[PDB]
Design an enzyme around this catalytic site. Structure first.
Site, PDB file in Angstrom:
ATOM      1  N   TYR B 184       0.812  -1.223   0.000  1.00 33.65           N
ATOM      2  CA  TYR B 184       0.000   0.000   0.000  1.00 33.65           C
ATOM      3  C   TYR B 184       0.860   1.295   0.000  1.00 33.65           C
ATOM      4  CZ  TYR B 184       0.296   1.202   5.066  1.00 33.65           C
ATOM      5  OH  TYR B 184       0.730   1.582   6.313  1.00 33.65           O
ATOM      6  N   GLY B 269       8.825  -3.005   3.105  1.00 34.44           N
ATOM      7  CA  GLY B 269       8.216  -3.367   4.386  1.00 34.44           C
ATOM      8  C   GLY B 269       8.605  -2.452   5.522  1.00 34.44           C
ATOM      9  N   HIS B 441     -30.683   8.358  -1.034  1.00 29.59           N
ATOM     10  CA  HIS B 441     -30.452   8.391  -2.479  1.00 29.59           C
ATOM     11  C   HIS B 441     -30.073   9.831  -2.888  1.00 29.59           C
ATOM     12  CE1 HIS B 441     -31.100   6.954  -6.654  1.00 29.59           C
ATOM     13  NE2 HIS B 441     -31.621   8.148  -6.876  1.00 29.59           N
TER      14      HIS B 441
HETATM   15  C1  LIG Z   1     -34.267  19.361  -8.297  1.00 30.00           C
HETATM   16  C2  LIG Z   1     -34.655  18.195  -7.417  1.00 30.00           C
HETATM   17  C3  LIG Z   1     -33.670  17.478  -6.734  1.00 30.00           C
HETATM   18  C4  LIG Z   1     -34.006  16.397  -5.920  1.00 30.00           C
HETATM   19  N1  LIG Z   1     -33.018  15.730  -5.273  1.00 30.00           N
HETATM   20  C5  LIG Z   1     -33.280  14.678  -4.467  1.00 30.00           C
HETATM   21  C6  LIG Z   1     -32.215  13.926  -3.752  1.00 30.00           C
HETATM   22  O1  LIG Z   1     -31.013  14.240  -3.867  1.00 30.00           O
HETATM   23  N2  LIG Z   1     -32.556  12.891  -2.974  1.00 30.00           N
HETATM   24  C7  LIG Z   1     -33.836  12.509  -2.818  1.00 30.00           C
HETATM   25  O2  LIG Z   1     -34.079  11.535  -2.080  1.00 30.00           O
HETATM   26  N3  LIG Z   1     -34.873  13.141  -3.432  1.00 30.00           N
HETATM   27  C8  LIG Z   1     -34.675  14.212  -4.254  1.00 30.00           C
HETATM   28  N4  LIG Z   1     -35.738  14.880  -4.912  1.00 30.00           N
HETATM   29  C9  LIG Z   1     -37.103  14.395  -4.668  1.00 30.00           C
HETATM   30  C10 LIG Z   1     -37.394  13.129  -5.455  1.00 30.00           C
HETATM   31  O3  LIG Z   1     -37.216  13.405  -6.844  1.00 30.00           O
HETATM   32  C11 LIG Z   1     -38.818  12.685  -5.178  1.00 30.00           C
HETATM   33  O4  LIG Z   1     -38.998  12.476  -3.766  1.00 30.00           O
HETATM   34  C12 LIG Z   1     -39.141  11.409  -5.937  1.00 30.00           C
HETATM   35  O5  LIG Z   1     -39.119  11.664  -7.347  1.00 30.00           O
HETATM   36  C13 LIG Z   1     -40.510  10.888  -5.549  1.00 30.00           C
HETATM   37  O6  LIG Z   1     -40.783   9.759  -6.356  1.00 30.00           O
HETATM   38  P1  LIG Z   1     -42.294   9.358  -6.678  1.00 30.00           P
HETATM   39  O7  LIG Z   1     -42.242   8.041  -7.389  1.00 30.00           O
HETATM   40  O8  LIG Z   1     -43.109   9.486  -5.425  1.00 30.00           O
HETATM   41  O9  LIG Z   1     -42.786  10.536  -7.650  1.00 30.00           O
HETATM   42  P2  LIG Z   1     -42.147  10.926  -9.068  1.00 30.00           P
HETATM   43  O10 LIG Z   1     -40.683  10.607  -9.136  1.00 30.00           O
HETATM   44  O11 LIG Z   1     -42.606  12.333  -9.359  1.00 30.00           O
HETATM   45  O12 LIG Z   1     -42.878   9.929 -10.106  1.00 30.00           O
HETATM   46  C14 LIG Z   1     -44.210  10.162 -10.545  1.00 30.00           C
HETATM   47  C15 LIG Z   1     -44.347   9.688 -11.980  1.00 30.00           C
HETATM   48  O13 LIG Z   1     -45.719   9.384 -12.223  1.00 30.00           O
HETATM   49  C16 LIG Z   1     -46.106   9.869 -13.506  1.00 30.00           C
HETATM   50  N5  LIG Z   1     -47.548  10.195 -13.446  1.00 30.00           N
HETATM   51  C17 LIG Z   1     -48.152  11.068 -12.620  1.00 30.00           C
HETATM   52  N6  LIG Z   1     -49.491  11.077 -12.829  1.00 30.00           N
HETATM   53  C18 LIG Z   1     -49.756  10.186 -13.800  1.00 30.00           C
HETATM   54  C19 LIG Z   1     -50.959   9.692 -14.509  1.00 30.00           C
HETATM   55  N7  LIG Z   1     -52.185  10.172 -14.214  1.00 30.00           N
HETATM   56  N8  LIG Z   1     -50.791   8.745 -15.458  1.00 30.00           N
HETATM   57  C20 LIG Z   1     -49.576   8.247 -15.771  1.00 30.00           C
HETATM   58  N9  LIG Z   1     -48.442   8.653 -15.166  1.00 30.00           N
HETATM   59  C21 LIG Z   1     -48.472   9.601 -14.195  1.00 30.00           C
HETATM   60  C22 LIG Z   1     -45.195  11.042 -13.797  1.00 30.00           C
HETATM   61  O14 LIG Z   1     -44.941  11.156 -15.197  1.00 30.00           O
HETATM   62  C23 LIG Z   1     -43.937  10.725 -13.016  1.00 30.00           C
HETATM   63  O15 LIG Z   1     -42.950  10.167 -13.877  1.00 30.00           O
HETATM   64  C24 LIG Z   1     -35.438  15.987  -5.760  1.00 30.00           C
HETATM   65  C25 LIG Z   1     -36.418  16.718  -6.452  1.00 30.00           C
HETATM   66  C26 LIG Z   1     -36.082  17.792  -7.269  1.00 30.00           C
HETATM   67  C27 LIG Z   1     -37.196  18.517  -7.977  1.00 30.00           C
HETATM   68  C1  LIG Z   2       4.119   6.067   4.283  1.00 28.26           C
HETATM   69  C2  LIG Z   2       3.194   5.540   5.350  1.00 28.26           C
HETATM   70  C3  LIG Z   2       1.813   5.709   5.243  1.00 28.26           C
HETATM   71  C4  LIG Z   2       0.958   5.223   6.231  1.00 28.26           C
HETATM   72  N1  LIG Z   2      -0.378   5.406   6.106  1.00 28.26           N
HETATM   73  C5  LIG Z   2      -1.237   4.952   7.045  1.00 28.26           C
HETATM   74  C6  LIG Z   2      -2.699   5.128   6.940  1.00 28.26           C
HETATM   75  O1  LIG Z   2      -3.171   5.721   5.954  1.00 28.26           O
HETATM   76  N2  LIG Z   2      -3.494   4.650   7.921  1.00 28.26           N
HETATM   77  C7  LIG Z   2      -2.982   4.010   8.996  1.00 28.26           C
HETATM   78  O2  LIG Z   2      -3.734   3.571   9.890  1.00 28.26           O
HETATM   79  N3  LIG Z   2      -1.658   3.804   9.156  1.00 28.26           N
HETATM   80  C8  LIG Z   2      -0.756   4.238   8.247  1.00 28.26           C
HETATM   81  N4  LIG Z   2       0.620   4.040   8.424  1.00 28.26           N
HETATM   82  C9  LIG Z   2       1.051   3.312   9.617  1.00 28.26           C
HETATM   83  C10 LIG Z   2       1.071   4.175  10.857  1.00 28.26           C
HETATM   84  O3  LIG Z   2       1.907   5.319  10.676  1.00 28.26           O
HETATM   85  C11 LIG Z   2       1.604   3.326  11.990  1.00 28.26           C
HETATM   86  O4  LIG Z   2       0.854   2.111  12.078  1.00 28.26           O
HETATM   87  C12 LIG Z   2       1.501   4.074  13.296  1.00 28.26           C
HETATM   88  O5  LIG Z   2       2.250   5.291  13.190  1.00 28.26           O
HETATM   89  C13 LIG Z   2       2.033   3.212  14.428  1.00 28.26           C
HETATM   90  O6  LIG Z   2       1.963   3.970  15.616  1.00 28.26           O
HETATM   91  P1  LIG Z   2       2.874   3.591  16.867  1.00 28.26           P
HETATM   92  O7  LIG Z   2       2.436   4.479  18.002  1.00 28.26           O
HETATM   93  O8  LIG Z   2       2.851   2.088  17.010  1.00 28.26           O
HETATM   94  O9  LIG Z   2       4.392   3.976  16.452  1.00 28.26           O
HETATM   95  P2  LIG Z   2       4.932   5.340  15.759  1.00 28.26           P
HETATM   96  O10 LIG Z   2       3.817   6.136  15.142  1.00 28.26           O
HETATM   97  O11 LIG Z   2       6.111   4.978  14.894  1.00 28.26           O
HETATM   98  O12 LIG Z   2       5.483   6.196  17.004  1.00 28.26           O
HETATM   99  C14 LIG Z   2       6.585   5.732  17.779  1.00 28.26           C
HETATM  100  C15 LIG Z   2       7.239   6.918  18.470  1.00 28.26           C
HETATM  101  O13 LIG Z   2       8.117   6.461  19.500  1.00 28.26           O
HETATM  102  C16 LIG Z   2       9.307   7.250  19.488  1.00 28.26           C
HETATM  103  N5  LIG Z   2      10.404   6.474  20.114  1.00 28.26           N
HETATM  104  C17 LIG Z   2      10.930   5.309  19.688  1.00 28.26           C
HETATM  105  N6  LIG Z   2      11.904   4.890  20.538  1.00 28.26           N
HETATM  106  C18 LIG Z   2      11.993   5.793  21.525  1.00 28.26           C
HETATM  107  C19 LIG Z   2      12.812   5.957  22.744  1.00 28.26           C
HETATM  108  N7  LIG Z   2      13.752   5.036  23.067  1.00 28.26           N
HETATM  109  N8  LIG Z   2      12.591   7.049  23.517  1.00 28.26           N
HETATM  110  C20 LIG Z   2      11.653   7.975  23.199  1.00 28.26           C
HETATM  111  N9  LIG Z   2      10.874   7.879  22.093  1.00 28.26           N
HETATM  112  C21 LIG Z   2      11.001   6.832  21.243  1.00 28.26           C
HETATM  113  C22 LIG Z   2       9.517   7.640  18.035  1.00 28.26           C
HETATM  114  O14 LIG Z   2      10.291   8.840  17.912  1.00 28.26           O
HETATM  115  C23 LIG Z   2       8.083   7.778  17.538  1.00 28.26           C
HETATM  116  O15 LIG Z   2       7.627   9.126  17.647  1.00 28.26           O
HETATM  117  C24 LIG Z   2       1.517   4.518   7.423  1.00 28.26           C
HETATM  118  C25 LIG Z   2       2.900   4.355   7.520  1.00 28.26           C
HETATM  119  C26 LIG Z   2       3.748   4.837   6.538  1.00 28.26           C
HETATM  120  C27 LIG Z   2       5.230   4.631   6.708  1.00 28.26           C
END
Ligand SMILES: Cc1cc2nc3c(=O)[nH]c(=O)nc-3n(C[C@H](O)[C@H](O)[C@H](O)COP(=O)(O)OP(=O)(O)OC[C@H]3O[C@@H](n4cnc5c(N)ncnc54)[C@H](O)[C@@H]3O)c2cc1C
Ligand SMILES: Cc1cc2nc3c(=O)[nH]c(=O)nc-3n(C[C@H](O)[C@H](O)[C@H](O)COP(=O)(O)OP(=O)(O)OC[C@H]3O[C@@H](n4cnc5c(N)ncnc54)[C@H](O)[C@@H]3O)c2cc1C
Ligand SMILES: Cc1cc2nc3c(=O)[nH]c(=O)nc-3n(C[C@H](O)[C@H](O)[C@H](O)COP(=O)(O)OP(=O)(O)OC[C@H]3O[C@@H](n4cnc5c(N)ncnc54)[C@H](O)[C@@H]3O)c2cc1C
Ligand SMILES: NC(=O)c1ccc[n+]([C@@H]2O[C@H](COP(=O)([O-])OP(=O)(O)OC[C@H]3O[C@@H](n4cnc5c(N)ncnc54)[C@H](O)[C@@H]3O)[C@@H](O)[C@H]2O)c1
Ligand SMILES: Cc1cc2nc3c(=O)[nH]c(=O)nc-3n(C[C@H](O)[C@H](O)[C@H](O)COP(=O)(O)O)c2cc1C
Ligand SMILES: Nc1ncnc2c1ncn2[C@@H]1O[C@H](COP(=O)(O)OP(=O)(O)O)[C@@H](O)[C@H]1O
Ligand SMILES: [Cl-]
Lengths: 459, 462
Positions: B184, B269, B441
């Site tokens: 990694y 490693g 959604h």
């Molecule tokens: C800009 C915008 C952004 C939105 N973003 C989100 C979002 O991020 N997340 C989220 O959860 N919700 C969002 N919504 C809301 C979401 O779109 C509605 O909650 C969802 O569409 C409701 O689904 P529905 O099936 O109840 O109604 P609708 O999706 O309106 O479906 C009704 C369908 O029935 C048909 N229909 C109606 N009457 C008749 C009929 N007499 N005969 C045949 N067909 C008919 C229509 O043509 C229509 O296609 C958003 C709405 C807008 C306007």
């Molecule tokens: C490039 C890289 C990327 C990484 N990315 C991730 C990640 O995305 N997510 C994740 O979970 N882990 C990641 N790790 C691993 C993570 O850094 C280690 O698992 C973590 O730091 C271990 O913590 P530790 O406390 O065991 O030891 P360390 O973090 O190494 O700390 C030990 C400390 O003890 C001190 N020390 C040692 N001996 C003595 C002494 N005799 N007297 C006083 N002080 C002393 C040192 O100076 C040091 O500060 C990554 C490691 C590397 C190398």
């Protein structure tokens, strides 16, 4: 041409197609009627298109060096965007997804009908197409007609005034844009346009943006709008257009102002589709402009079900899909099928907001004594490596047994935490479960573990 | 000048500092000793620096139009990069975080001494600095000395031959880089340099890259390496350097080529730090090069604990942190409440690999009868909107009771799914739980649900 089926689904959106698929997989003869395109609002003019254009705008912002590229030692030169091609790319994705939905419906034994459906009674529907006129009978009628944008009475859709639909398929980028509504739709699109070089102004009647979410959670979004250069007109209502095409805006005190604009996005809400297709004949109980339902999506008429936006808030795709699956399961005679205690949501603004379950205020309103704790991304290593240190993660739990009842997060790239929020809630995790769960380092998700522990610290 | 405490922590890395902080919070008088910089390897020359440089490289790739910007209608002009400034930016992040660890150690009541610590015996240590020395008695000795890069004796570090440390603080970008070892660390850094315009070649002794992961899971990483232009020399051993500074490689059959290079990264490693500080006196049992420990981090000597890399694989920071926290809690008197949880991992290559629990191979090796299913991101709506359709999410579950025993995912930007995987495993989710959990959604996360249903479909089949 008289036809018959067991389950007749009106609407081919997330609710409708997921319901029909599951139904077919369960062996229920099913017919799905759709007037326009499969996938409904969600695929054609909602979720996917918005998320697609958000990706283009973020990509254009970064190419312009507006996302802190200079600090990284990257000196950029101005790029160019051909918005028509961005929209064409977005349309391609929508094309692939619609076909996939269509093929999945076929594979499940569902017969799709392309037509406009008019309800005659609880067990009879007329489907009208280009010259066609068929009458279909059914045992169960599943209403999933969705919703449409709410039109401002003083400023209808036409010309310079557009809905989210046209905002998602622009032919050109306007110089100045005024958005009415600081809800998730207006802000998501408002930010898209601002990042693409457009002068954007947002008009909201509430005292702050995103009124549906709490204050603390929204603050980092407010700050972002400030840095991006978006002009906010809070506590102001729109009175309409003037002769020069500018939007007339009135404040709380009464004094008004006009914001110039050659494009106006009205995103004040969404209205359930209940009118114009013989739904009057059924006389179903109503919940506002939506069809009333019990917790199993049944209407007041037996064997007449309703799901998705036509059944009210929350208007989310996953909620409509989950509701549809539950209805299909019930029709197939399956018991123990309940909607989860918490539905997650993601608002794709910058920063993003993710929630599932109760906020501290929702927990107090439901009469449950809860504690909460947050962890800021300013102290998270991963966030720093991403230049996305604003925001935080908050955990909400019962004071007595520490059962987690809610999760909220605000920050850049926190959307995928949604799965951790809804799954932990579905499993009934306690603060101690999360506090004891080892999280990979370095990740934004580590903030969840730290929030739980912090809640257990000042418990 | 004799001093005394209960817990004396040797090492200020993720294991050491988290242990000292926890212990301090629990009211245990604690002394932590660090010879270099707080944060250890993880913050100063490992986790953070690598992720930071990966961010710079990703930013540059995108600025150049090498991540499909043209398809989105975005036409770019080539950028330039000042790598010295990229390194300065990274060192700034590192420095901020180290000072955060320092402040938290003080706020927790921990006394931090800067110096080389040497073991006199299991209850006594010597902390030496420039013209200063102290003998410190303790009741519990915590060894958290970490790890160091493995040096190839046949190609030692020096000049053009560098370890991960120097590769993370380049003064200049080389024209040609040869990386030894496709683990990694080698691939993460190999990719950073390649994306920045360097010609990169990777030499690996194993048949494929990332030999510690299954073939199916790494296939998209090998495909991306080809797309990026990274040259792979698989089934090859590095012999040494010829007079021209090139890398002499030997294939399996005996034939041998030379890879021209003006910079060579040796990432074969990592080795635990157990030499040169008085451990020899304590006859502590060993697990290969590392210190042998039980599931509670106790060595073969009483009140002598060992955590993190000094205690062997898997060498990850979050594991070190978990162990350090467990040890403090044990010394405080609190009994363990949760059994040692599954250790997730994120490989930040492009695409990324995320894993938690067992892969199908690990499950069969443990003797547990499992089935698994995958769901490709090519069919996921969110993935399409992010131009990240390669890869998939896989779920692994027991055939007898549907309990999920593992999750794996490979794709661009899938790292944050780690929380979901880790939390579900700790809660004991079954395919049914995931399958019936609503997922927002549109999200990559929806693939987890789809994968669980896929698997459940097979489990319930006639
Ligand atoms: C800009 C915008 C952004 C939105 N973003 C989100 C979002 O991020 N997340 C989220 O959860 N919700 C969002 N919504 C809301 C979401 O779109 C509605 O909650 C969802 O569409 C409701 O689904 P529905 O099936 O109840 O109604 P609708 O999706 O309106 O479906 C009704 C369908 O029935 C048909 N229909 C109606 N009457 C008749 C009929 N007499 N005969 C045949 N067909 C008919 C229509 O043509 C229509 O296609 C958003 C709405 C807008 C306007
Ligand atoms: C490039 C890289 C990327 C990484 N990315 C991730 C990640 O995305 N997510 C994740 O979970 N882990 C990641 N790790 C691993 C993570 O850094 C280690 O698992 C973590 O730091 C271990 O913590 P530790 O406390 O065991 O030891 P360390 O973090 O190494 O700390 C030990 C400390 O003890 C001190 N020390 C040692 N001996 C003595 C002494 N005799 N007297 C006083 N002080 C002393 C040192 O100076 C040091 O500060 C990554 C490691 C590397 C190398
Ligand atoms: C051919 C070979 C000979 C070894 N000889 C000795 C020895 O004499 N004494 C000893 O104490 N330890 C030896 N080792 C072990 C070595 O020092 C590391 O401890 C070990 O490679 C750690 O691997 P890992 O599983 O932790 O993978 P990681 O640390 O995750 O990745 C390191 C990668 O580098 C590769 N690698 C190692 N050496 C070479 C090489 N010469 N050319 C190309 N790739 C290489 C490995 O296959 C591995 O995939 C040898 C390893 C190899 C592959
Ligand atoms: N000069 C070249 O362009 C070249 C030649 C052979 C192989 N390769 C690469 O090695 C891979 C395996 O191909 P194969 O099955 O024909 O070879 P192989 O698997 O039979 O073994 C590789 C042999 O080709 C030689 N070689 C020359 N350039 C190499 C390179 N860049 N990488 C690896 N080996 C190289 C080695 O000395 C070695 O004996 C391919 O992906 C290919 O890109 C490249
Ligand atoms: C700690 C240690 C690590 C080693 N690691 C490797 C390695 O990763 N790869 C390798 O080919 N040889 C490794 N070797 C041995 C080399 O093959 C070396 O060139 C050979 O054994 C000759 O050693 P000599 O110079 O002591 O005779 C290692 C040796 C030691 C002591
Ligand atoms: N039916 C309606 N007619 C006129 N204005 C409306 C209607 N529904 C909502 N509004 C206006 O929309 C604004 C709120 O928008 P917003 O916060 O975006 O809501 P949502 O998040 O539901 O879209 C307020 O100014 C409110 O008065
Ligand atoms: Cl289900």
């Amino acid at each position: 041409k008289n036809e018959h089926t067991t389950l007749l689904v009106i609407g081919g959106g997330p609710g409708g197609y997921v319901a029909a698929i599951r139904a077919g997989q369960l062996g229920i003869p099913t017919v799905l009627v759709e007037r326009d395109r499969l996938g409904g609002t969600c695929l054609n003019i909602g979720c996917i298109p918005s998320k697609a254009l958000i990706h283009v705008a973020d990509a254009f912002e970064q190419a312009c060096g507006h996302a802190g590229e200079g600090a990284l030692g990257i000196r950029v030169r101005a790029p160019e965007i051909d918005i028509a091609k961005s929209v064409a790319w977005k349309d391609g994705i929508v094309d692939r997804l619609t076909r996939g939905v269509g093929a999945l419906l076929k594979k499940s034994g569902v017969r799709v009908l392309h037509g406009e459906a008019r309800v005659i009674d609880g067990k009879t529907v007329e489907v009208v197409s280009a010259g066609h006129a068929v009458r279909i009978g059914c045992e169960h009628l599943l209403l999933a007609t969705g919703s449409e944008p709410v039109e401002l009475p003083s400023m209808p859709f036409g010309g310079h005034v557009v809905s989210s639909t046209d905002a998602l398929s622009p032919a050109t980028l306007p110089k100045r844009l005024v958005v009415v509504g600081a809800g998730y739709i207006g802000l998501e699109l408002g930010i898209v346009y601002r990042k693409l070089g457009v002068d954007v102004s947002v008009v909201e009647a509430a005292e702050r943006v995103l009124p549906a979410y709490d204050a603390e959670l929204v603050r980092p979004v407010a700050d972002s709008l400030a840095r991006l250069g978006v002009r906010l007109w809070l506590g102001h209502k729109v009175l309409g257009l003037d002769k020069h095409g500018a939007v007339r805006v009135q404040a709380a005190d009464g004094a008004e102002q006009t914001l110039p604009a050659d494009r106006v996005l009205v995103a004040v809400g969404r209205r359930p589709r209940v009118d114009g297709f013989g739904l009057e004949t059924l006389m179903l109980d109503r919940n506002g402009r939506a069809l009333r339902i019990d917790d199993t999506c049944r209407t007041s008429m037996r064997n007449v079900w309703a799901i998705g936006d036509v059944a009210g808030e929350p208007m989310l795709a996953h909620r409509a899909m989950a509701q549809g699956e539950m209805v299909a399961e019930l029709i197939a005679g399956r018991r123990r099928q309940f909607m989860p205690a918490a539905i997650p949501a993601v608002c794709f603004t910058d920063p993003e907001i993710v929630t599932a379950g109760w906020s501290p205020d929702d927990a107090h309103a439901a009469g449950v004594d809860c504690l909460s704790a947050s962890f800021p991304f300013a102290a998270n290593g991963r966030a720093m490596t991403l230049q996305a240190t604003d925001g935080f993660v908050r955990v909400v739990a019962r004071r007595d047994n520490h059962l987690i009842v809610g999760w909220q997060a605000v920050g850049r790239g926190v959307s995928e935490l949604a799965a951790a929020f809804s799954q932990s809630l579905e499993m009934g995790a306690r603060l101690e479960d999360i506090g004891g769960t080892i999280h990979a380092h370095p990740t934004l998700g580590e903030a969840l573990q730290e929030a739980a522990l912090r809640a257990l610290g000042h418990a």
